[PDB]
Structure formats: C-alpha cells, structure tokens
Design a protein around this motif. Structure first.
Motif, PDB file in Angstrom:
ATOM      1  N   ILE A   1       0.816  -1.218   0.000  1.00 60.94           N
ATOM      2  CA  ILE A   1       0.000   0.000   0.000  1.00 60.94           C
ATOM      3  C   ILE A   1       0.847   1.264   0.000  1.00 60.94           C
ATOM      4  O   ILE A   1       0.536   2.186  -0.769  1.00 60.94           O
ATOM      5  CB  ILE A   1      -1.021  -0.045   1.145  1.00 60.94           C
ATOM      6  CG1 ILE A   1      -2.141  -1.032   0.814  1.00 60.94           C
ATOM      7  CG2 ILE A   1      -1.590   1.339   1.423  1.00 60.94           C
ATOM      8  CD1 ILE A   1      -3.078  -1.292   1.960  1.00 60.94           C
ATOM      9  N   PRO A   2       1.907   1.397   0.808  1.00 60.65           N
ATOM     10  CA  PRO A   2       2.713   2.628   0.743  1.00 60.65           C
ATOM     11  C   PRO A   2       3.342   2.883  -0.618  1.00 60.65           C
ATOM     12  O   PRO A   2       3.830   3.997  -0.845  1.00 60.65           O
ATOM     13  CB  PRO A   2       3.786   2.409   1.819  1.00 60.65           C
ATOM     14  CG  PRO A   2       3.174   1.447   2.765  1.00 60.65           C
ATOM     15  CD  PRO A   2       2.338   0.533   1.923  1.00 60.65           C
TER      16      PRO A   2
ATOM     17  N   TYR B   1       1.732   2.605  -3.788  1.00 62.22           N
ATOM     18  CA  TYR B   1       0.799   3.384  -4.594  1.00 62.22           C
ATOM     19  C   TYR B   1       0.278   4.603  -3.848  1.00 62.22           C
ATOM     20  O   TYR B   1      -0.172   5.559  -4.489  1.00 62.22           O
ATOM     21  CB  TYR B   1      -0.362   2.505  -5.089  1.00 62.22           C
ATOM     22  CG  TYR B   1      -1.364   2.034  -4.048  1.00 62.22           C
ATOM     23  CD1 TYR B   1      -2.292   2.907  -3.492  1.00 62.22           C
ATOM     24  CD2 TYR B   1      -1.398   0.703  -3.650  1.00 62.22           C
ATOM     25  CE1 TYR B   1      -3.207   2.473  -2.553  1.00 62.22           C
ATOM     26  CE2 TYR B   1      -2.313   0.259  -2.713  1.00 62.22           C
ATOM     27  CZ  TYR B   1      -3.214   1.150  -2.169  1.00 62.22           C
ATOM     28  OH  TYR B   1      -4.127   0.714  -1.235  1.00 62.22           O
ATOM     29  N   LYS B   2       0.394   4.596  -2.517  1.00 59.37           N
ATOM     30  CA  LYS B   2       0.006   5.804  -1.745  1.00 59.37           C
ATOM     31  C   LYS B   2       0.937   6.932  -2.181  1.00 59.37           C
ATOM     32  O   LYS B   2       0.481   8.091  -2.226  1.00 59.37           O
ATOM     33  CB  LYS B   2       0.124   5.546  -0.244  1.00 59.37           C
ATOM     34  CG  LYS B   2      -0.736   4.398   0.251  1.00 59.37           C
ATOM     35  CD  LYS B   2      -2.202   4.604  -0.023  1.00 59.37           C
ATOM     36  CE  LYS B   2      -2.796   5.703   0.830  1.00 59.37           C
ATOM     37  NZ  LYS B   2      -4.091   6.168   0.286  1.00 59.37           N
TER      38      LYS B   2
ATOM     39  N   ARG C   1      -4.735  11.454   3.092  1.00 58.92           N
ATOM     40  CA  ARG C   1      -4.498  10.208   2.377  1.00 58.92           C
ATOM     41  C   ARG C   1      -5.498   9.977   1.249  1.00 58.92           C
ATOM     42  O   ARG C   1      -5.435   8.939   0.585  1.00 58.92           O
ATOM     43  CB  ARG C   1      -4.513   9.022   3.351  1.00 58.92           C
ATOM     44  CG  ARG C   1      -3.158   8.712   3.997  1.00 58.92           C
ATOM     45  CD  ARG C   1      -2.713   9.773   4.998  1.00 58.92           C
ATOM     46  NE  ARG C   1      -1.339   9.559   5.454  1.00 58.92           N
ATOM     47  CZ  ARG C   1      -0.977   8.660   6.366  1.00 58.92           C
ATOM     48  NH1 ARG C   1      -1.886   7.880   6.936  1.00 58.92           N
ATOM     49  NH2 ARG C   1       0.298   8.541   6.712  1.00 58.92           N
TER      50      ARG C   1
ATOM     51  N   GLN D   1       3.843  11.238   2.672  1.00 62.08           N
ATOM     52  CA  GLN D   1       3.650  10.481   1.445  1.00 62.08           C
ATOM     53  C   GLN D   1       4.021  11.284   0.207  1.00 62.08           C
ATOM     54  O   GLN D   1       3.864  10.782  -0.912  1.00 62.08           O
ATOM     55  CB  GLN D   1       2.199   9.993   1.345  1.00 62.08           C
ATOM     56  CG  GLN D   1       1.877   8.864   2.315  1.00 62.08           C
ATOM     57  CD  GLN D   1       0.391   8.586   2.430  1.00 62.08           C
ATOM     58  OE1 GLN D   1      -0.435   9.320   1.887  1.00 62.08           O
ATOM     59  NE2 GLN D   1       0.041   7.523   3.150  1.00 62.08           N
TER      60      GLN D   1
ATOM     61  N   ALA E   1      -1.968  -1.069   7.003  1.00 62.86           N
ATOM     62  CA  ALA E   1      -2.777  -0.689   5.825  1.00 62.86           C
ATOM     63  C   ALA E   1      -3.602   0.511   6.278  1.00 62.86           C
ATOM     64  O   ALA E   1      -3.047   1.620   6.316  1.00 62.86           O
ATOM     65  CB  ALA E   1      -3.666  -1.849   5.456  1.00 62.86           C
TER      66      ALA E   1
ATOM     67  N   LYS F   1      -5.449   2.755   5.207  1.00 60.53           N
ATOM     68  CA  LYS F   1      -5.413   3.976   4.435  1.00 60.53           C
ATOM     69  C   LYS F   1      -6.003   3.612   3.100  1.00 60.53           C
ATOM     70  O   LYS F   1      -6.867   4.274   2.550  1.00 60.53           O
ATOM     71  CB  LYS F   1      -4.006   4.506   4.141  1.00 60.53           C
ATOM     72  CG  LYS F   1      -2.876   3.511   3.909  1.00 60.53           C
ATOM     73  CD  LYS F   1      -1.552   4.263   3.785  1.00 60.53           C
ATOM     74  CE  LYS F   1      -0.339   3.446   4.179  1.00 60.53           C
ATOM     75  NZ  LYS F   1       0.814   4.349   4.453  1.00 60.53           N
ATOM     76  N   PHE F   2      -5.601   2.460   2.632  1.00 57.14           N
ATOM     77  CA  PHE F   2      -6.141   1.917   1.383  1.00 57.14           C
ATOM     78  C   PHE F   2      -6.131   2.849   0.173  1.00 57.14           C
ATOM     79  O   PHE F   2      -5.632   3.969   0.237  1.00 57.14           O
ATOM     80  CB  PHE F   2      -7.572   1.458   1.674  1.00 57.14           C
ATOM     81  CG  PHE F   2      -7.646   0.244   2.543  1.00 57.14           C
ATOM     82  CD1 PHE F   2      -7.215   0.285   3.855  1.00 57.14           C
ATOM     83  CD2 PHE F   2      -8.141  -0.944   2.045  1.00 57.14           C
ATOM     84  CE1 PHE F   2      -7.281  -0.834   4.645  1.00 57.14           C
ATOM     85  CE2 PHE F   2      -8.206  -2.065   2.837  1.00 57.14           C
ATOM     86  CZ  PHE F   2      -7.775  -2.013   4.130  1.00 57.14           C
TER      87      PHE F   2
END
Lengths: 406, 407
Positions: free
Chosen positions: A143-144, A146-147, A303, A343, B404, B406-407
């Motif tokens: 996930i980090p 594509y975040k 986010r 991010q 996770a 946050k998705f």
C-alpha cells in the motif's frame, strides 16, 4: 539501529554475516531446512563465519532469535529458492514466518540489497495464501507504494498497480462471507478485505455493498448491518452526494463510537472536494463534530487521492490557531504534521515542507517535523530509482506469453 | 462503604444518579466540560436528578466533593468520550484526575457496569502519559491481573499481557536515566520503572543492568551504584546461581537498612526453587536471617511466579511455631495469611484455604482469613468472566499495530 544478517548458501557451505544496520555482537542464529524437522541453532559470535549441513539443502530459512525488528537477507540465489517454497507448498514454513520473509524482502528493496523485481515476484505467492498474518504484512508493504503514486502525476501505473494488488487477493476476497461469523482473527481479515476490494472498484464488492447500503439507507438506517462489513458499505455510500449527506445525518444521531468511527472513514473517502473542505472547517471549529476527532479526519483526507492537497493547504493557513487547541509537543500535532506530508515524493515538496516549517521560528524543531523530512527524502530516492521498475514489471506480468505448450 | 455516581449525558441533558454501593445523601457533584472555563457546583440531593448545560459539550468530567474513595461511572457512551480525551490531548484534565479515571474504570469492571474490553482500551492512552500518579495507578490496576495468572496454567496470555504492559510504558522507560537526578517524584518513577522493565525480560533494561551488576560484582561491591537503579540491578543479578550466592554474601556485610531491604527483594525473585526454600527455613529459625524478616519474605516469596506454592505449603506445615513467634491477633500474622493466598483463583484453592483454617478449631476465626477468603472468591468471578476476553483483546491489539488502514 537494528541488527542485519546476510546469508549466502553455496551448496552445503552456509556462510553467515552480521552487520548492525542503521556493529558486532553475539547474534544467535537459528535455521530450518527442507531436510530438518527440528530447529537448528548456531551462536554467531563474529562478523563472518561458516556453518555446514550434512547434505545439500533445497531451501534454507534463517531467522535470528531476538525480539523486535531484524532483517534476514538471503542474497539473490537464496531468495529465489525461498520463493519456490512459498509457491508450491508454503505450509512448510510457519504462518508468522511467512510474514517475516515479506517484511524482510520489501524493506531490503529500500535498503538497496535487493531489486524490487524480486520482491514483487515474491508477492505473487499471495494468490494461494490464506492465513491473515502474511496477507496484512503483504498489504503492509504494498500500500505505501501506490500511496506515493497518488501524490504524483501517475494514473496508468497507479490503476495497473491497484488492479494487480486486487489480483493476488481476488481468490481470498470472493471467499469472505459478508457476516460476523468465525473467529476474531479472520473477522479482522474480512472487514479489512471487503474494505479493500470495495475501495478499488472491485465490482463484486461495490455492487454488493451498494445493495446492502440501499437496504440500510432506504430503511432509514434501521436494518442491522453486520459489523465487519459495515466499513465497506459505508465507504461506497459516501461516494454519491445523496449517500454522503444522509450518511452524515445519521452520524449525529449515533451513540456508538464504533459506528461513529466507521462513518468518519467513509465521509473522507469521497472524491468531492467541497464536502471534505467542510469536514475540515467544521471539525476544526468544533460544533457539529468534535475537535477531538479532527486528527482522525485531517489524516484520512490527507491520504485521499484527491483530498491530499486540501489537508496540506489547511495546515499552512491554520497553523497558529491549531497549536492553541492541541499544543506543539502533543501526539496529535505530531500525528497531524506527518499524515499530510510523509507520502510526498517530489523534489518540490521538499522545499515546500522544509520552507514552511523553517519560517515558523520557534513554532520548526519538533521531532515529528524532522522525522517527516527524512521519510520524504526516503520516498524521493525510493521512487526515483524504483518507479520505472514497477512500470515495466506490471507490464510483463499481464502476460499470463501463451507458452508452456508450443 | 463508598458512594458511586452514574452519569448519562445526552446533548445538554446531563442525567446523574447516586447509589451508595457496597443510601442517599447530599452529594456535592462538581464537574468540568470541554466548553467550561469555570468549575460548576451542582448539589445533588436526590436519587436521580438532571441539570442542563448552556451549549453542547464534547466531554464532561465529574468529581464528588467528599474525600475518601468514590467511583464515578460515566456509562458506556460517556466513557468513550473520555477515552478520546486522554488520547488526543490528555493535558486537559488534571494529573490526579487522570489517575482517578483509571482507578474508577478498572474497578467498575469488577462491579460489573463496564466490560474489560473497554477498560483495557482506555489503558492504551498511557503511552503518552508522563506524570507518575497515572503511571502508578495504571500499574496499580493492571499488575494484580497477571499475578492471578501467575498462579494458574496461563503462560501465553501472561507473557503477551506482560509485553503489552511494557509496550505502554516503553517510551517512558527509555527516557528514564540510570542515575539519582531529578526530584523525588522523578526518582520514584525511575526506580520502579527500571525495576518493572528489568523484571519482564525487557532487554534494554537487562543489558544495562547486567553490565552494572558485573561492575558492582567484580569490584566486590565497592562502587556506589545509584540508589534508584540498585533495585533492578540486584533483581536481575540474583537470577543466576553465581549472582545469588554472592548477592547473599554481601547482605551480611551491610549496616544500611535501605541497602539491606533492596537485597531482600532480589533474593526472592529467582526462579530457583531450592534457593527460595532455604530462605524460608533460615528466616524462620533465625540465625542467618532475622526471624523479624520472615513475614516480609514469606509474602514476596509467595508473590514469585514460580515460588508461590512453597510459601503456601510452608505456612501450612509451620502454623503452630508461627503463632508463638508472632501471635494470632498481630498484623504480622494477618499480612502473612493474606500474602500467600489472596491471588489464588481456582475452585480448589478456595476449598484448600477454607479447609486448612477450619481445621484449626479455636486457633481459624481471624479477620485476615475472612478478608482473604473474600478476595479469593472475588478473584474467581473476575477471572471466570474476564479471562477469555483479555485473551482476544491482546489478539485484536497486535493486529492494531496492520499498517494498511489507508487503502
């Protein structure tokens, strides 16, 4: 920092090496082989040393033996051997140790002793993974990636990445029942897995969620939605304007923090820029929604694929009034300053973030401000080096090449 | 008995109710709200009554206007509001009020008006807690939970509970210097926090303590270890057989009761069964160790995770000689009768304890035997209800560490 161990197997000549990364101690290494049924122990007392097995070995798994974080790097030839283990019969190694291989693999990509092509290739084993521990730890490292892409001009690589992530878990997503049965462990997996599929436009989840939301919405919120699913049902509802205004109209009439917390997540995932701006203004002012709940909102908006600039835009204009309601040193300020920034992965956000906090004079020297400039600089290098790799890796993966035949 | 007050806030409609638990008086309730700049002083004169606030309120903190002990129960929907306070900006309420919320919360779990799942979730705020009084009051309600687990066949939940307990205070543990600096408050927090961390195999406490112990050991006890640290250094030292025999050999050469008292704790936490049995025999007979120190030893020996059956078995066999050396009615016998028993939580330890004291005939009727049978019966119900819950709470908290979200 933490102790790092490199392993280099050459036939039956198991070489070892210790390096306390980020220097020397007596590192107690354990390992297990394809042949072994028992745990073999070795007390490594030097920078480098060698251990020998009777016969050559199909796969060697090293874990150290301390508490806390440690990375076991297996070198190139050894990672490939471990991949074949998790693809044919992953039940050999334990459930929690499988998660350990993933944590080590992907964090070695950041360190630089492993190309992302090999870690991404290891992730492909998830397709048959059932146990909750690797699934989250796999979701923990992916996930980090594509975040960071959301915060950049990256839509084709992002959409192809997000489809790939759903591709591994597709088999497990479709098996998850939409109830609250089974043990507590998988229920956490269910709740988080249904939330994952539904967020990434996975039709069998969204359409299923909209149907559940309609029966709950049309009944004026009177039908008992199962608790685990509720996250995904509320998330898809808040996408439409009609579902969002209603979803908030029940947020007020609630005396259940669990129901209150799931709606808050839902109300932040909307791509609507006007509705999020209002959530910031109202939670900040503290009348319709508590100011206490403001951090859990500024973060989840920061986010949002589309709401991330608003959180950053809100923090700069509303810095001074925010410190009086929360105080610099508190964990809320720290949590807030990171969620809107950590991010970003551009050479321009660095001067934007550094420039803003430097001007604050004595209000500029927080541990959370230093800790976020580092994680941004880590993200800049990580993306600048590994972005093009993920682009071409996702290309050459759709190909099933129609071979294995001829 | 003590007065307990329940509060139910609905918008600006703050309902309250008085019930003297364990009947009616003019209870002066004071409170402070998120909006309020001034202390409000409502005089509650009836079983139930209601007061109205000007504007809506994010959180309300009630205190009673008497001294002694009282429990303020904030209902289910109201406890959640206070938890969010101590997690975001706990500096709003006072240091003593933070301890008060913890004492009430966990003691409401025993009364039955609050599930253990919610109280354990409140404890999670400690990670940001600095002040000593909430830290101790939090440590005050949590420690008796696993000391009941020590006496039972519960090892995975016990080690998982103790790691969670260290997990909360870990951040504060790493800031505590290993000196005698700061005020007595900081020194008290330091001494017991290092003492606590070192006990639970927290390596950063072990490595620093083992190194300190050797340099104190190798120097034949000639270098002045800081006083606050001394407790933890001696405790980890006495675990080895080599460290224990020496640690006792310096107990003799001391003319300092403060130094003398630190060794006493150390020599009893060793997992060695033979060494503890000897401490009981010698303190009782009174030549190597004073007979005066037998109660202060039999108790904490009974508090050892592995040495608890020896203290209980020793007290039973040595009752008659104990009455002549200490006398039934004295507080020393009372302290002894409780320390070896009041953490048992089985349907068989209850009958074991009840059976032994009933056989003594006219020697069997103390206040300490009744007061300990009560706390044993209390422990049985508490565990029978709340044990399985804490098992899964520690499960679903490790998963609150997924990244996770946050998705």
């Amino acid at each position: 920092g933490f102790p790092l161990i490199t392993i280099t197997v050459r036939g039956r000549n198991v070489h070892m090496k210790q390096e306390h990364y980020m220097y020397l101690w007596h590192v107690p290494l354990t390992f297990i082989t394809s042949k072994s049924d028992m745990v073999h122990r070795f007390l490594l007392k030097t920078k480098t040393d060698v251990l020998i097995l009777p016969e050559e070995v199909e796969w060697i798994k090293f874990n150290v033996g301390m508490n806390g974080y440690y990375i076991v790097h297996y070198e190139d030839d050894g990672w490939d051997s471990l991949t074949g283990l998790l693809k044919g019969t992953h039940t050999a190694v334990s459930s929690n140790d499988r998660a350990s291989l993933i944590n080590n693999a992907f964090q070695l990509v950041s360190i630089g002793k492993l190309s992302i092509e090999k870690a991404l290739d290891l992730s492909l084993y998830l397709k048959h993974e059932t146990e909750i521990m690797p699934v989250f730890q796999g979701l923990n490292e992916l996930i980090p990636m594509y975040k960071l892409m959301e915060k950049r001009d990256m839509n084709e690589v992002e959409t192809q990445f997000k489809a790939f992530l759903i591709r591994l878990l597709r088999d497990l997503i479709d098996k998850q029942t939409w109830t609250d049965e089974g043990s507590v462990s998988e229920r956490m997996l269910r709740s988080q897995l249904l939330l994952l599929a539904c967020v990434h436009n996975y039709q069998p989840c969204v359409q299923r969620a909209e149907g559940y939301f309609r029966k709950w919405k049309e009944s004026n919120g009177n039908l008992s939605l199962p608790v685990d699913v509720t996250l995904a049902v509320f998330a898809v509802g808040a996408q439409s304007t009609e579902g969002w205004d209603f979803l908030y109209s029940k947020y007020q009439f609630s005396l259940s923090s669990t129901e209150k917390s799931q709606i808050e997540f839902a109300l932040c995932r909307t791509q609507n820029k006007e509705k999020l701006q209002w959530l910031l203004d109202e939670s900040f002012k503290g009348d319709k929604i508590k100011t206490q709940e403001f951090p859990q909102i500024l973060t989840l908006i920061g986010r949002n694929p589309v709401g991330y600039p608003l959180a950053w835009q809100f923090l700069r204009k509303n810095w001074n009034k925010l410190v009086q309601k929360f105080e610099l040193g508190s964990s809320s300020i720290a949590h807030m300053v990171m969620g809107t920034t950590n991010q970003f992965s551009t050479r321009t956000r660095l001067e934007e973030v550094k420039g803003f906090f430097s001007s604050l004079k004595e209000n500029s020297q927080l541990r959370c401000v230093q800790q976020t400039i580092e994680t941004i600089e880590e993200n800049i290098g990580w993306m600048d080096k590994n972005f093009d790799k993920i682009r071409v890796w996702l290309q050459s993966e759709k190909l099933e090449f129609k071979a294995r035949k001829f």
